[PDB]
Amino acid sequence: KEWQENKSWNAHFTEHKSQGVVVLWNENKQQGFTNNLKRANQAFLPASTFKIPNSLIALDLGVVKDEHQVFKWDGQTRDIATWNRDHNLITAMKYSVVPVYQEFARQIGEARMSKMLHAFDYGNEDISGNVDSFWLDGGIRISATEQISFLRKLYHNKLHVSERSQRIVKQAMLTEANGDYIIRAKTGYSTRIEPKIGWWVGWVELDDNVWFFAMNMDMPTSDGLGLRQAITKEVLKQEKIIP
Amino acid sequence: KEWQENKSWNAHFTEHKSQGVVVLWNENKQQGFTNNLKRANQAFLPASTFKIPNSLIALDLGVVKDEHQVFKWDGQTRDIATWNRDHNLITAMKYSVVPVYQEFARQIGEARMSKMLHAFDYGNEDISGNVDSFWLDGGIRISATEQISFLRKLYHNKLHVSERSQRIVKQAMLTEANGDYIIRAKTGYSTRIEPKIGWWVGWVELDDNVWFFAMNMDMPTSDGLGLRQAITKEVLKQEKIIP
Numbered sequence A, B: 001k002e003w004q005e006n007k008s009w010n011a012h013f014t015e016h017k018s019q020g021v022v023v024l025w026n027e028n029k030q031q032g033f034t035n036n037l038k039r040a041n042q043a044f045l046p047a048s049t050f051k052i053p054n055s056l057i058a059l060d061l062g063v064v065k066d067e068h069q070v071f072k073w074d075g076q077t078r079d080i081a082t083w084n085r086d087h088n089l090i091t092a093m094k095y096s097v098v099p100v101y102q103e104f105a106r107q108i109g110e111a112r113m114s115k116m117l118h119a120f121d122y123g124n125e126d127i128s129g130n131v132d133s134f135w136l137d138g139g140i141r142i143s144a145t146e147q148i149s150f151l152r153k154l155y156h157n158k159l160h161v162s163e164r165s166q167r168i169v170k171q172a173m174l175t176e177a178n179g180d181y182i183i184r185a186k187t188g189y190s191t192r193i194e195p196k197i198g199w200w201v202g203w204v205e206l207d208d209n210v211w212f213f214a215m216n217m218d219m220p221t222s223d224g225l226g227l228r229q230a231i232t233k234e235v236l237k238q239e240k241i242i243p
């Protein structure tokens, strides 16, 4: 009743000779759907999907004042051109600007970071590793279904940070909007520790329902990153959630 | 020069056998642009663009608890099908649901509505007429440049309501988002007093600037309503604000 497996969605992965999981949660009906119940519960490094809780914590502690505060480029040229510039919270989430969030994490510090992930009930709650890289190559692990549980709390302003912090992070998560739906989401790409995977987690707002989603997929090269959104959207289309 | 007139935009109205004004404001440069300085400063009924201030006031007074509160359809069949359903603040804005906002206005009441529009410096601040219809056929008037002035305060959380109220209304204004821009805006259609006009007011968020806009145009029939957005976007494209 609560979770239903739809193996027909595997066709959207084998289409591209790829492997992964899409997890959906119908908020109105309190019912979940996935192509792979086991992998839906397999826990991986969050990689840049960790920017959602990191943002919440940085805002609630005042490390980030608001979504307009500028974090200046430190002058080090990195391999991702969009990182080599000034950012605010909105553009730092849009371009997954790791070095900006590493500064947040150092200012938050290990103790507060650990306590807040416990308060959030986030994944395995384990920040072992460098305080500014554990979500990329440390001990923290989270599954797609755990991502959904966390996102539902955020959607409902039920996380143990201020309402304001939650509203700002949901603004920064804005990814796509049109007359048919709004998507608030965050991508991730885990490359430092095997298995290399891509993530996309968030939700689709409709007029009268919300569909939460979390997907990950094997990602041996960066060439396939667009499949994170494309496969998710094929599932959403199949299930008549978006046109 | 603070204000510049660009009459070449008139071609975008003439193309459609129309007349109107677009007003743009470059926030970084503090410079404004319009095709018609006179009409930019002529005042019209706000019609449904009034849902921006009405939302703010309803939220700040607690008439509306939050963006999820459901305003049940009163069961009176109206001729706009999307009005014959339950709404929250988000969908009421999206579908310009007049009867929901009329009830907001009744609960706000004349005295508080008047005081708040003065605090907002909103248009001619005149609510003469019926409290449940003055933005459709009463004495209130606002120009395109006055819409920009009000919207800039909202963007900066500088209106005399809480930050929370302003964030909620800006969420409810969300109209379009993609990798290139975000538009937050509200349409309007004034038919009860001549000249009948259409409005579109809001702003375009870019990575490193905001462009505020306010347009109105003659609208003898509802068949032309899509020109509000189409003409605005042609101006935005011409000025290399959006691709």
Ligand SMILES: O=C(O)c1cc(-c2ccncc2)cc(-c2ccncc2)c1
Pocket: A047, A048, A080, A096, A098, A187, A188, A189, A222, A225
């Ligand atoms: O989520 C992404 O879309 C993405 C994330 C990263 C990244 C995130 C965190 N630590 C390192 C890299 C890198 C890239 C990328 C794009 C093109 N060519 C190479 C890499 C894309």
Ligand SMILES: O=C(O)c1cc(-c2ccncc2)cc(-c2ccncc2)c1
Pocket: B047, B048, B080, B082, B094, B095, B096, B098, B187, B188, B189, B225
């Ligand atoms: O875009 C508009 O400005 C507009 C759109 C609708 C509408 C929304 C959804 N489905 C159909 C029409 C209704 C109205 C309206 C405003 C005031 N008095 C009556 C009608 C105006």
Ligand SMILES: [Cl-]
Pocket: A170, A171, A174, B170, B171, B174
């Ligand atoms: Cl938003």
